[PDB]
Design a protein around this ligand. Structure first.
Ligand SMILES: [Cl-]
Length: 127
């Protein structure tokens, strides 16, 4: 059982996460230009509120390299609710099994950083 290599982007507003073409891949100096491609997957947790009924928390969007993670089998551009795709110029459309996912027992998450000039929808924040 594994985890995203990066911390999540929390959705504070009504808009799903979306990036303009060529944007959205997190910075990771340990990966190469061919690897800069993947998807974000929405994870929506539920909690028992103060009243006593269940409710959704803010959705969290986690990045996974193409061909890894909970949707490792999906090809780039696959239509699936809660999955959005991103790729940098120069990336290769091949599975990134060599990067894989993170084992939290032996690796901390990488703080998710987006390069300068990256635009986001309302309610998401870039570090
Ligand atoms: Cl947050």
């Amino acid at each position: 059982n594994t985890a995203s290599w990066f911390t999540a982007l929390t959705q504070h507003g009504k808009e799903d996460l979306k990036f303009s073409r060529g944007q959205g891949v997190p910075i990771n100096t340990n990966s190469s230009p061919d690897d800069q491609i993947g998807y974000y997957r929405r994870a929506t947790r539920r909690i028992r509120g103060g009243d006593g009924k269940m409710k959704d928390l803010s959705p969290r969007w986690y990045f996974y390299y193409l061909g890894t993670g909970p949707e490792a089998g999906l090809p780039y551009g696959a239509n699936k609710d809660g999955i959005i795709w991103v790729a940098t110029e120069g990336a290769l459309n091949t599975p990134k099994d060599h990067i894989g996912t993170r084992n939290p027992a032996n690796n901390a998450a990488i703080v998710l950083q987006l390069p300068q000039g990256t635009t986001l929808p309302k309610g998401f924040y870039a570090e």
